[PDB]
Amino acid sequence: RSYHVVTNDTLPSALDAIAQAPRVALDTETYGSNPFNLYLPDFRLVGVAIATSPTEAWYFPVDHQDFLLRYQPANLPREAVRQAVLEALKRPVVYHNAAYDRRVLAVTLDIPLDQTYGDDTMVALHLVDENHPLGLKEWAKTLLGLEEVNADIEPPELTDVHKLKPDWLQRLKDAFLAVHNGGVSYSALYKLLNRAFQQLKNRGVVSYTGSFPNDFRLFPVDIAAIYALDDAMNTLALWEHVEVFFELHPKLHALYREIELPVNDVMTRATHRGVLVDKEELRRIKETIQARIEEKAQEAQELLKALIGSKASEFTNPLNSPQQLSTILYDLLGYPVVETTPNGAPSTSKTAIAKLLTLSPKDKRKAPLAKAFLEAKQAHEGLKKLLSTYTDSILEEVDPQGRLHTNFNTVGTVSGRMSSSNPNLQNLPRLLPEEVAEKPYLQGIDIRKAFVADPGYTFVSADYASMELVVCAAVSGDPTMRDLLNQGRDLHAYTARYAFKVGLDLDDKAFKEQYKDYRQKAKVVNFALIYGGTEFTLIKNFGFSEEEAKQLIQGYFEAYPVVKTWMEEVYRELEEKGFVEYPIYGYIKRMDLPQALRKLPKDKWPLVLNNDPDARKQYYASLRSCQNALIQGFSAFVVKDAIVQMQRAFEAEGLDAQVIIQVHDEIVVLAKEEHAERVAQIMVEKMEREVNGVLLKAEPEFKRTLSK
């Protein structure tokens, strides 16, 4: 491997090599307080790695700096590095995490997302093995046979305890290269650099406060460029493997080019744009949460006052302090200790408290107050978690111009759904009537109301009507399920009418009124039974009676029998082939087999399964996970497909619209007020379709906040 550190003199040769390269890889080395929030004023680009072949790369130092001694070469001018990247973009480009690197290039070098589109090994390799980690380090060990070296390297003698050796940097680089056969780890590189400066501090060479700082800017470029350049060469080497795999699977090659890479691009642009944040409304949520956390402590106090009487004065902060808490629950109330900490003290944790909301205390008369007391503690920690996750940890991250840049990981689930972070939009409570009535402390805590559309802009939101049921009927292919969905009939009333055999003449509207709570028991089944259903799952999860569970499950399969036969074939094909192929998209959902069974003849499998109960537990969990992913993953790709198609049409019609967020069965676009009209039209046209004869419909809304 040839590692080049580019200088003003070497730049024309690096440009010549890039121009001649058949395909190039781009990797960025950066620094920030949050190196992920590129939009904070402290964020900086340190260097750019450009690999022209799997064995040749060029490092462009941009913001490297000198620690105590003068060893760094002159950083290249920002315009020189930008011209190198622009020349590299003319050739076919490959990235490992294009969503990050393309946003780095746009923020630090002003190279718009328009120019920076390229291939992404991390996205393509997710189609090769979704159960494999996304890490470039991890994939390099898996396909390229290159483990990272995490040994402890000790430096050569850089002194002669009086004079620094003139060639000390060449001596240090050579000590590093002697152990770099498969490539040194970042931790090991830091340890050697720190050890080298510590030897210098022990001699009279340098005098620094304490330890060497963990700052890539200070790592000598001659050594650091080896690390950075290996990442770019490994990305290119991994792409060679991807092209071979795509030869074997042209259905996945087309799924990658038409849906996966374009959807990644759409969501990279969405993170880049960022949603505007109402800081005033955030303070109201923060102040309302803070008020309610305090409210819940007074509730706990008045409850404790009745629970332990006059001894309740002897406790000032029972909820917060786990000292006063374990004394109350166990020592005083006589609660059965069904969990302890590593140090053997009785555990007052979230998990342990969930258990005591079934269990009972010594005086069974105090039980309704003890229940109320633990419920107050649950609500207290519930409200307390909302603050520590999204009021302050959401306000920290807001860029100078008040926008929040939510990250989306296009390949963030084994099913194929998008992951979301900073903020995880899934874990933002959309205050649904059931969500609230279960956990009522959420009432009024609308976090999405603080996510605002810019002045002159609107949010055009569109939600797939009862998608889970549509997708279920589509993937399974039950005609009864499909026809009811197309006829707009209450699928749940059809289930309850078959499971209980009551009122076989009350229309779907009349049945809802008369046998109300039996229709809602079927509404639970129609949704939970798609992901594999047994009487055990209905009881050990929903609190169903043994009589009720059998009534419902026999009716669900009597009414929609193709669901049963479909489910039989999914579990049968998974047990034999070890994977399933997605109906319309062709995504392969492979099973995450236990380490035993991996590279083992199927005839040798029963020996493993029949003996090892841990491996069989992994096997059967992996089997259910694949079946579940067939439904979530199918709708994930349907939504992904709609996003790229609607976004392509906004671009085509010259509209000021861009898909800003997507969560659950919902797509939100940030559109200019005049364009909102047509944006909503395009949204519904690209969203509504007829999957396997099952009709998908979607109703649009013009919101000014992401709120519900």
Residue numbers in the entry: 2 to 161, 179 to 726
Sentences from the paper on this structure:
The structure of PolI_G20c was solved with the aid of the structure of an exonuclease termed ExnV1, which was determined in parallel in this work and originates from an Icelandic virus metagenome collected from several hot springs in Iceland. The gene coding for ExnV1 may be part of a truncated gene that originally encoded a DNA polymerase I. A novel structural motif, SβαR, that was not previously associated with DNA polymerases I was identified in the solved structures of ExnV1 and PolI_G20c. Residues 152–185 are missing in chain B of PolI_G20c; however, the residues corresponding to those in ExnV1 are present and from the sequence alignment it is interpreted that PolI_G20c also resembles ExnV1 in this area, which is part of a novel structure motif (SβαR) that is discussed further below. The major difference between the two proteins is that ExnV1 only comprises the smaller 3′–5′ exonuclease, whereas PolI_G20c also includes the larger palm domain that is responsible for the polymerase activity. The SβαR structural motif consists of two β-strands followed by two α-helices that are connected to each other via a short β-strand.
Sequence and structural analysis of PolI_G20c revealed a 3′–5′ exonuclease domain and a DNA polymerase domain, and activity screening confirmed that both domains were functional. Since ExnV1 only includes a 3′–5′ exonuclease domain, the gene encoding ExnV1 is most likely to be truncated. It is concluded that PolI_G20c belongs to the DNA polymerase I family but lacks the typical 5′–3′ exonuclease domain. With these data at hand, the structure of PolI_G20c was determined to 2.97 Å resolution. The structure of PolI_G20c consists of two polypeptide chains, A and B, that could possibly be arranged as a dimer according to PISA structure analysis in CCP4mg. In PolI_G20c the supposed two long β-strands are only seen as one-residue β-strands 8 and 9, since there is a gap in the structure, although if all of the amino acids in the structure were seen we propose that they would resemble the long corresponding β-strands in ExnV1. The maximum activity of PolI_G20c and GoTaq was measured at about 70°C, while IsoPol BST+ exhibits maximum activity at 65°C. IsoPol BST+ also exhibited significant activity at temperatures below 40°C, whereas PolI_G20c displayed very limited activity below this temperature.
